[PDB]
């Protein structure tokens, strides 16, 4: 895949390694969404929550989906498209997750739900783009949401999805 795909992926592995060495909480203290308004101008935090992973399983499952769906968007729609999808979903899915359950969360799966959402609807409305998501998967992405409802970031997942559908919509009617 392409530069944005690999970069991200180097970013996540670097940050995971540091969590192994320093501990989750010490990376959390610097990379998590601000828990205190005093911290509101530490602008990296609105994005960096997305680099943190909490087990080998967390990271591998996330990078897998990210490489498959992010690689597809980068190659058919270009590097800038992946950046924008990434920055908006990371910002908005953090925002909603922080309201639902507080600032202590991380992982790329909010961005990934946006990628799932964007790839599916865009595959539906503009087959000419040459991206698509198999049916078997959105329904799965839907059933991963109900088990999280009953320790998943549930607001990150639905807000990510919403951002994905919206942008795809706005991108297809164009």
């Amino acid at each position: 895949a392409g530069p944005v795909t690999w970069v991200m992926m180097i970013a996540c592995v670097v940050v995971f390694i540091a969590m192994q060495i320093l501990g989750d909480q010490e990376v959390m203290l610097w990379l998590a969404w601000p828990f205190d308004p005093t911290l509101k101008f530490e602008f990296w935090r609105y994005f960096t929550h997305a680099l943190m992973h909490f087990s080998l399983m967390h990271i591998l499952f996330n990078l897998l989906w990210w490489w498959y769906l992010g690689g597809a968007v980068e190659k058919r729609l270009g590097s800038g498209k992946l950046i924008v999808i990434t920055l908006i979903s990371a910002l908005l899915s953090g925002y909603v997750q922080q309201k639902f359950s507080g600032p202590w969360f991380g992982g790329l799966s909010g961005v990934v739900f946006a990628l799932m959402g964007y790839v599916w609807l865009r595959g539906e409305r503009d087959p000419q783009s040459g991206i698509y998501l198999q049916r078997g998967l959105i329904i799965f992405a839907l059933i991963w949401i109900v088990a999280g409802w009953f320790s998943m970031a549930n607001g990150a997942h639905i807000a990510g999805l919403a951002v994905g559908l919206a942008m795809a919509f706005v991108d297809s009617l164009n």
């Binding site: 991380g106 799966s109 999280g148």
Partner: peptide, 5 residues
Amino acid sequence: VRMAA
């Protein structure tokens, strides 16, 4: 801590 998943 919640995983985004």
